[PDB]
Amino acid sequence: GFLSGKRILVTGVASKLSIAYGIAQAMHREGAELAFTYQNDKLKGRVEEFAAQLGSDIVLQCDVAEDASIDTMFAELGKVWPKFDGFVHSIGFAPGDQLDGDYVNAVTREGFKIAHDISSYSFVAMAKACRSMLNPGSALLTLSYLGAERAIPNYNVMGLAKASLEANVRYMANAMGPEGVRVNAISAGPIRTFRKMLAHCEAVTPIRRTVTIEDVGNSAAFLCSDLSAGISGEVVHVDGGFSIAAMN
Amino acid sequence: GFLSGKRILVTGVASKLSIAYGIAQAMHREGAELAFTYQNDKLKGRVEEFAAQLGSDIVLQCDVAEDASIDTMFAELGKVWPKFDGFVHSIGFAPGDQLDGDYVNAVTREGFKIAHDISSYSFVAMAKACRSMLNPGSALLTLSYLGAERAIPNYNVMGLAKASLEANVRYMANAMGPEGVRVNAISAGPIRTFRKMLAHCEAVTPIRRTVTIEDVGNSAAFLCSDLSAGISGEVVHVDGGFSIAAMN
Amino acid sequence: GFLSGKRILVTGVASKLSIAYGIAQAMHREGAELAFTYQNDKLKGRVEEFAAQLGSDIVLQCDVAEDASIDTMFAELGKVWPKFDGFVHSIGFAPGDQLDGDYVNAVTREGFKIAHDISSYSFVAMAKACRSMLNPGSALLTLSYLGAERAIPNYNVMGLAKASLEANVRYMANAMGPEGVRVNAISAGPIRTFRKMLAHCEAVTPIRRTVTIEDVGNSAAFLCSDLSAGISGEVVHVDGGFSIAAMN
Amino acid sequence: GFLSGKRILVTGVASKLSIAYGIAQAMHREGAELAFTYQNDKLKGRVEEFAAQLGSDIVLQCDVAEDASIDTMFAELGKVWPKFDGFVHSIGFAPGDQLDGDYVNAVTREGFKIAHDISSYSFVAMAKACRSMLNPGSALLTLSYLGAERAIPNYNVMGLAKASLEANVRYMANAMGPEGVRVNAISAGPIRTFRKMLAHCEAVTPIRRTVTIEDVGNSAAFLCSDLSAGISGEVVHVDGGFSIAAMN
Numbered sequence: 001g002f003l004s005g006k007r008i009l010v011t012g013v014a015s016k017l018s019i020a021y022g023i024a025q026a027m028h029r030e031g032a033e034l035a036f037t038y039q040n041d042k043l044k045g046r047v048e049e050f051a052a053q054l055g056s057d058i059v060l061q062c063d064v065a066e067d068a069s070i071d072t073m074f075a076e077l078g079k080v081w082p083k084f085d086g087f088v089h090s091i092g093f094a095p096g097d098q099l100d101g102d103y104v105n106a107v108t109r110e111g112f113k114i115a116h117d118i119s120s121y122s123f124v125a126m127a128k129a130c131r132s133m134l135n136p137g138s139a140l141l142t143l144s145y146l147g148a149e150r151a152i153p154n155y156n157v158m159g160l161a162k163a164s165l166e167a168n169v170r171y172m173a174n175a176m177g178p179e180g181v182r183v184n185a186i187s188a189g190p191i192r193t194f195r196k197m198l199a200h201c202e203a204v205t206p207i208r209r210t211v212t213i214e215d216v217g218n219s220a221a222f223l224c225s226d227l228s229a230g231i232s233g234e235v236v237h238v239d240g241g242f243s244i245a246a247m248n
Numbered sequence: 249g250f251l252s253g254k255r256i257l258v259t260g261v262a263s264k265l266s267i268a269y270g271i272a273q274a275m276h277r278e279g280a281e282l283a284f285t286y287q288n289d290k291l292k293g294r295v296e297e298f299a300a301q302l303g304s305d306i307v308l309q310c311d312v313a314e315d316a317s318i319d320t321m322f323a324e325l326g327k328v329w330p331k332f333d334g335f336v337h338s339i340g341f342a343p344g345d346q347l348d349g350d351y352v353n354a355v356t357r358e359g360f361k362i363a364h365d366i367s368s369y370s371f372v373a374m375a376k377a378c379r380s381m382l383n384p385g386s387a388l389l390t391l392s393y394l395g396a397e398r399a400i401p402n403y404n405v406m407g408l409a410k411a412s413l414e415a416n417v418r419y420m421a422n423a424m425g426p427e428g429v430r431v432n433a434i435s436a437g438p439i440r441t442f443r444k445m446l447a448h449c450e451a452v453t454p455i456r457r458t459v460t461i462e463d464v465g466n467s468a469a470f471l472c473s474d475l476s477a478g479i480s481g482e483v484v485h486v487d488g489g490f491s492i493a494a495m496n
Numbered sequence: 497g498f499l500s501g502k503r504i505l506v507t508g509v510a511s512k513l514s515i516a517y518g519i520a521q522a523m524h525r526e527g528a529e530l531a532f533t534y535q536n537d538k539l540k541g542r543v544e545e546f547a548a549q550l551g552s553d554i555v556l557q558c559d560v561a562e563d564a565s566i567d568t569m570f571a572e573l574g575k576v577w578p579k580f581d582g583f584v585h586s587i588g589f590a591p592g593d594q595l596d597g598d599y600v601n602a603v604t605r606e607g608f609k610i611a612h613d614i615s616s617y618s619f620v621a622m623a624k625a626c627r628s629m630l631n632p633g634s635a636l637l638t639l640s641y642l643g644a645e646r647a648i649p650n651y652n653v654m655g656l657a658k659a660s661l662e663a664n665v666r667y668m669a670n671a672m673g674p675e676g677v678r679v680n681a682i683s684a685g686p687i688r689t690f691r692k693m694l695a696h697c698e699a700v701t702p703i704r705r706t707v708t709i710e711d712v713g714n715s716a717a718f719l720c721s722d723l724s725a726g727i728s729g730e731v732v733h734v735d736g737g738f739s740i741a742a743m744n
Numbered sequence: 745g746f747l748s749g750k751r752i753l754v755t756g757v758a759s760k761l762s763i764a765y766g767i768a769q770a771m772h773r774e775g776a777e778l779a780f781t782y783q784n785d786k787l788k789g790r791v792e793e794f795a796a797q798l799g800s801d802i803v804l805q806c807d808v809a810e811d812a813s814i815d816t817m818f819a820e821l822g823k824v825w826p827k828f829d830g831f832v833h834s835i836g837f838a839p840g841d842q843l844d845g846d847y848v849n850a851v852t853r854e855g856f857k858i859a860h861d862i863s864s865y866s867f868v869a870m871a872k873a874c875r876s877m878l879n880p881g882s883a884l885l886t887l888s889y890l891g892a893e894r895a896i897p898n899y900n901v902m903g904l905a906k907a908s909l910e911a912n913v914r915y916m917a918n919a920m921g922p923e924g925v926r927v928n929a930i931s932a933g934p935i936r937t938f939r940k941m942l943a944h945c946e947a948v949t950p951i952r953r954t955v956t957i958e959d960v961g962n963s964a965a966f967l968c969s970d971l972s973a974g975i976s977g978e979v980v981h982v983d984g985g986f987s988i989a990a991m992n
């Protein structure tokens with residue numbers, strides 16, 4: 001495929017519905033050699049299976065809240081992949097309490113801190129830890145959501161974390177571009193990984209249907225291939241034109 | 249390729265350096281059946297050659313300033329392609345006088361009128377004329393430039409025409425999305441189709457080089473394939489991250 | 497008031513409901529000396545009567561569709577205001593059939609030409625005709641609408657013209673800054689100058705209410721006073737936060 | 745003045761050069777009654793002396809890094825202003841080493857945590873602590889910078905925090921609108937509160953000059969007065985049009 005000859009690390013695969021899962025399927029399909037990570041033991045075995053399917057037996061543990069964990073994982077990965085071509089950052093989180101009800105009432109210093117640390121900082125923490133291992137022409141990818149650009153009910157602090165992550169994409173792209181590395185994001189429309197949210201999106205979205213992990217996977221597979229060589233620091237909307245419409 | 253089974257019309261191919269040329273090369277490479285148009289006789293024979301190379305002997309005349317010319321061309325095209333899957337709108341123009349020196353002094357009512365008619369209206373004029381001939385899953389594509397979002401010296405009225413064209417993309421996408429048609433644009437970085445402009449871009453661009461018709465072609469080939477099924481109404485920047493940087 | 501010493505030309509007063517009307521009162525209240533224009537024989541009386549109430553007796557005819565009408569009006573104005581400090585451009589028009597139903601079917605080459613000419617080109621045309629009459633410290637202001645950034649049902653081709661207009665604001669600001677002129681736009685929320693539109697807006701609007709011609713007028717007075725000396729080429733949203741919200 | 749009747753809290757006054765300082769004078773000039781805060785023992789004297797010159801004797805300590813410090817300060821304020829009409833948030837900080845050199849190498853998990861906490865979270869933290877003390881018609885204002893939208897050399901992690909901050913502005917506006925509170929930000933151009941930066945800016949800036957704390961103060965006074973009743977969740981650019989220009 002258009003990813004033949006590329007070595008790509010994929011984080012965040014927690015189930016067959018996970019966006020990261022849809023992305024690995026498509027990159028594999030296009031011939032990329034894959035490697036996966038898992039947040040903790042409770043998910044290992046399970047992530048080892050997905051990897052076997054995509055011709056990969058590279059399954060490493062990594063918690064992004066810890067630098068030591070990130071470095072340790074890239075050390076292992078380094079054993080089988082002294083060099084590689086980028087990674088898919090598909091990690092997101094905020095304390096349950098943070099995402100419901102009035103934003104100003106829900107947000108807490110700690111809530112803000114964790115959501116920004118896990119959802120935004122982990123992206124450059126990861127680039128930071130593997131920077132000398134990336135080949136020229138490598139590409140990094142992360143996932144955002146429209147809640148970064150607009151105020152969406154309940155999305156609350158996760159919206160500030162995503163605005164931060166989107167800016168992280170421009171700064172990472174600007175600093176890593178000179179050594180042949182591109183960095184972008186995909187702002188996905190809602191995907192079940194609410195039933196109302198999804199109903200709504202569907203009727204108001206230009207393409208008249210919510211997008212899928214397959215739709216996102218192909219966009220990610222392309223954004224991490226040399227096909228998108230002229231694109232860096234971009235937040236591509238793969239939400240069927242939802243954000244560009246109004247009052248449908 | 250990822251365009252096998254798609255029938256795509258390509259306008260604006262005026263030479264081997266034309267963006268439209270770079271786009272046809274890539275769509276052909278990916279297996280799309282192509283068809284070309286030419287503004288006038290002075291370019292026919294020449295455009296008939298490019299077409300033969302890309303396995304196409306469908307070369308039709310079409311001046312977008314005339315509805316009759318657009319309808320007549322789609323009538324011919326209809327003879328060999330009763331249905332097809334979209335087109336690449338790679339047309340741009342403004343009276344020479346309009347693009348140099350102070351904007352407020354250069355712009356003229358006529359200058360404004362022509363630049364907006366040829367660069368922006370011709371895009372939906374074309375969708376309008378072939379709308380019943382598009383298959384489900386079709387995709388339309390046009391080309392814009394950063395001058396639509398920011399005030400660039402000398403670009404003058406062409407910048408208002410491109411802002412118009414970018415908005416045209418959202419409205420066309422919003423109206424045609426329900427019948428399975430997506431519409432997007434690619435805002436390309438500067439491409440020689442100045443020597444200073446290009447010098448500058450190159451040093452300040454994240455990827456440290458100006459983009460190419462090949463880089464744009466692959467992005468266009470992807471945006472017109474089902475790979476980008478979840479993307480509509482978007483202006484993708486294929487300028488190496490130039491617009492997202494500042495003061496490099 | 498903060499506009500004392502300021503001589504500003506105001507266009508587009510058609511009724512006490514008119515946005516240009518709320519703007520003229522606001523500016524008058526803050527001490528500006530005003531001059532008015534009226535499009536034709538039908539509006540002359542209404543405009544003369546308002547100019548009188550606002551303490552003005554400069555009531556000049558002007559059809560921005562015509563360069564000659566623009567020059568003649570400014571020659572008239574210059575006999576009483578050899579120099580003045582800017583003008584409000586509150587003009588808008590698209591042929592009746594352009595604004596209802598599917599965008600691509602409603603739009604036509606002529607409907608497009610006129611919407612852009614009247615709604616966008618007329619702004620810089622006026623700036624051209626009076627460029628040498630503006631004191632440094634002058635400010636030009638126009639009015640746009642969210643339809644310029646999102647695809648809004650039925651706004652159709654007016655969305656494209658507004659987009660062309662907002663770019664005009666950027667190019668005119670960049671061109672005229674060196675001589676002490678600022679150029680901005682207010683992107684106002686909908687105002688009854690639909691019943692459902694206004695009904696939808698009010699509940700999903702951050703400030704929980706549609707904006708009034710008093711809100712737009714006060715922001716207009718600000719954007720044309722020395723208070724906004726540091727703001728130029730900006731599109732200020734005065735829609736109660738409507739556009740920065742989503743899925744409310 | 746247009747702020748008579750208004751009681752506003754101003755944070756971040758550190759010197760006569762301070763932006764919060766130009767803002768306090770401007771607001772004072774327009775008739776606002778002010779209250780001030782100072783971060784620590786080192787700034788208390790300077791702040792007391794300015795409060796005196798601006799006719800105020802409410803000078804309270806507050807370290808936004810601490811929730812308790814925020815509550816205590818508002819309990820102090822409430823004894824003299826049971827209700828007031830908003831506050832200016834002009835606070836910013838990132839550890840010394842964060843702002844120079846390559847972005848990815850300079851950033852660290854701690855430098856990131858602190859920049860976001862102090863520069864972004866503190867805004868809503870203050871809004872939390874005093875939410876019930878705001879009269880309807882209140883306005884909250886903060887200060888951002890273009891580094892939030894473009895990747896700007898050396899601004900590094902502060903760009904991510906500002907981005908998080910501007911989204912905060914949107915989420916706080918959407919949350920507090922229903923109770924009559926507006927929330928906005930001024931994205932100011934650079935001010936000496938570098939010599940080359942300022943040198944570059946001035947020549948490529950539309951208004952041909954860097955902005956002053958008087959320009960930012962007048963726009964601040966406006967954004968916190970009833971004059972801006974129709975503006976909420978907006979990021980107003982007060983940079984002389986710098987950001988809407990390119991390749992100047």
Ligand SMILES: NC(=O)c1ccc[n+]([C@@H]2O[C@H](COP(=O)([O-])OP(=O)(O)OC[C@H]3O[C@@H](n4cnc5c(N)ncnc54)[C@H](O)[C@@H]3O)[C@@H](O)[C@H]2O)c1
Pocket residue numbers: 011012013014015017018019020038039062063064065090091092093118143144145187188189190191192193
């Ligand atoms: N589902 C949607 O509607 C949607 C839409 C747009 C964007 N996104 C974004 O896509 C990304 C993936 O989300 P998803 O919908 O696939 O959900 P998901 O639960 O399937 O995947 C997210 C991953 O977060 C990982 N994670 C959490 N904390 C971690 C830590 N401390 N260390 C390492 N890994 C950790 C988990 O292992 C998990 O697999 C997120 O950034 C999310 O914000 C989701």
Ligand SMILES: NC(=O)c1ccc[n+]([C@@H]2O[C@H](COP(=O)([O-])OP(=O)(O)OC[C@H]3O[C@@H](n4cnc5c(N)ncnc54)[C@H](O)[C@@H]3O)[C@@H](O)[C@H]2O)c1
Pocket residue numbers: 259260261262263265266267268286287310311312313338339340341366391392393435436437438439440441
């Ligand atoms: N070259 C750059 O630096 C650059 C960068 C970004 C975007 N673009 C855009 O890409 C598009 C293609 O430009 P290009 O650089 O390939 O130049 P080009 O000259 O190679 O192609 C543009 C085409 O305009 C066509 N044209 C003009 N009037 C026409 C009419 N009345 N009817 C039918 N066709 C007509 C010509 O046939 C010509 O081939 C334009 O819209 C341009 O604005 C160019």
Ligand SMILES: NC(=O)c1ccc[n+]([C@@H]2O[C@H](COP(=O)([O-])OP(=O)(O)OC[C@H]3O[C@@H](n4cnc5c(N)ncnc54)[C@H](O)[C@@H]3O)[C@@H](O)[C@H]2O)c1
Pocket residue numbers: 508509510511513514515516534535539558559560561585586587588589614639640641683684685686687688689
């Ligand atoms: N009403 C709203 O809800 C709303 C919302 C957002 C933006 N706007 C914008 O504000 C501006 C004013 O609109 P309005 O609602 O006050 O409408 P309006 O009908 O009250 O006034 C607009 C004016 O356009 C003038 N005009 C039209 N063609 C002209 C020509 N050829 N020459 C000279 N004058 C001409 C008319 O005399 C008229 O008074 C427009 O640009 C509009 O797009 C209106």
Ligand SMILES: NC(=O)c1ccc[n+]([C@@H]2O[C@H](COP(=O)([O-])OP(=O)(O)OC[C@H]3O[C@@H](n4cnc5c(N)ncnc54)[C@H](O)[C@@H]3O)[C@@H](O)[C@H]2O)c1
Pocket residue numbers: 756757758759761762763764782783787806807808809833834835836837862887888889931932933934935936937
């Ligand atoms: N100076 C510029 O060119 C410029 C340009 C654009 C935006 N800004 C923004 O304007 C705001 C003001 O910056 P400035 O240039 O006036 O700098 P400044 O040093 O004059 O003032 C900022 C204030 O931050 C306060 N502060 C820091 N940590 C604090 C804490 N933990 N608790 C309480 N107070 C604390 C300090 O007392 C200080 O007075 C910032 O948010 C900055 O990012 C400045």
